[PDB]
Amino acid sequence: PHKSSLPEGIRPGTVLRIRGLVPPNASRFHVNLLCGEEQGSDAALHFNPRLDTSEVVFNSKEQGSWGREERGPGVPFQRGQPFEVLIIASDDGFKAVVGDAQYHHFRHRLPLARVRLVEVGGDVQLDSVRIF
Amino acid sequence: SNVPHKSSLPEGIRPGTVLRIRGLVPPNASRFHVNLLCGEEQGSDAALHFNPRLDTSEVVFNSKEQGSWGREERGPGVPFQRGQPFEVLIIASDDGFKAVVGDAQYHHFRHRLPLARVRLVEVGGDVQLDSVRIF
Ligand SMILES: CC(=O)N[C@@H]1[C@@H](O)[C@H](O[C@@H]2O[C@H](CO)[C@H](O)[C@H](O)[C@H]2O)[C@@H](CO)O[C@@H]1O
């Protein structure tokens, strides 16, 4: 479960670039933007490609409980295929771009200034996470 | 080549807008530019003029306001090369445009004109464009 702090935190204009590869037998994976390093922290953003149920869920987790989930249109991920995801924080939400195409917009539920680290986990071969 | 390349931005741009430009600098390139213009008229104001000069080995950033060019800012060295491809990310943030060349932070240009005035992206000069995407 990859983890990495966001030194200056994240703000409108912060881009997260995740490059990786979906393992040949992957079932699903996720990227979480957490507000604390404590286990079970509020997730300002939970991005979850599910190669098995063929859907991509976006969601929040606050004070311990999940929230209203949103689903993207289709799964822009292929097993055994490499990918590149851009997560862009704008003044009003996170834009999820998957290889040259805007995929989904997620409106902020917790305040951007509460996000402190990225966590990438699940069935994924993570090559690199870069914050711009 | 696909230059000059012009892309309209009807609703303008805001903090969190990303411009990704990929292309090849050709063998005899002198220089090329990426402008964030305020109108489609010739000589329009420019919130951002990004100008890699392969012929003088400098990378210049400027703005044009009221038909008047501002004070040029120079980035740290030339991270471009004739006969070599490139990828540039111009990210609009709360206080400036972040220029990322070749996977590394290259220069930060503090805003000079209000972001709400940008209405066009133009790419031209000695460059052979692969793609310009705006996210
Ligand atoms: C159709 C539907 O409502 N499905 C939901 C599932 O999304 C949900 O699964 C969990 O979802 C969270 C994010 O919402 C995490 O991805 C977690 O890993 C999943 O187990 C389940 C459980 O809440 O409820 C329905 O099945």
From Swiss-Prot, chain A:
It is found in: Cytoplasm; Nucleus; Secreted. InterPro entries: ConA-like_dom_sf, Galectin-like, Galectin_CRD. Gene3D superfamilies: 2.60.120.200. Mainly expressed in stratified squamous epithelium. Residues 2-132 form the Galectin domain. This is Galectin-7. SUPFAM superfamilies: Concanavalin A-like lectins/glucanases. Monomer. It holds the Pfam family Gal-bind_lectin. Could be involved in cell-cell and/or cell-matrix interactions necessary for normal growth control. Pro-apoptotic protein that functions intracellularly upstream of JNK activation and cytochrome c release. It comes from Homo sapiens (Human). A beta-D-galactoside binds at residues 66-72.
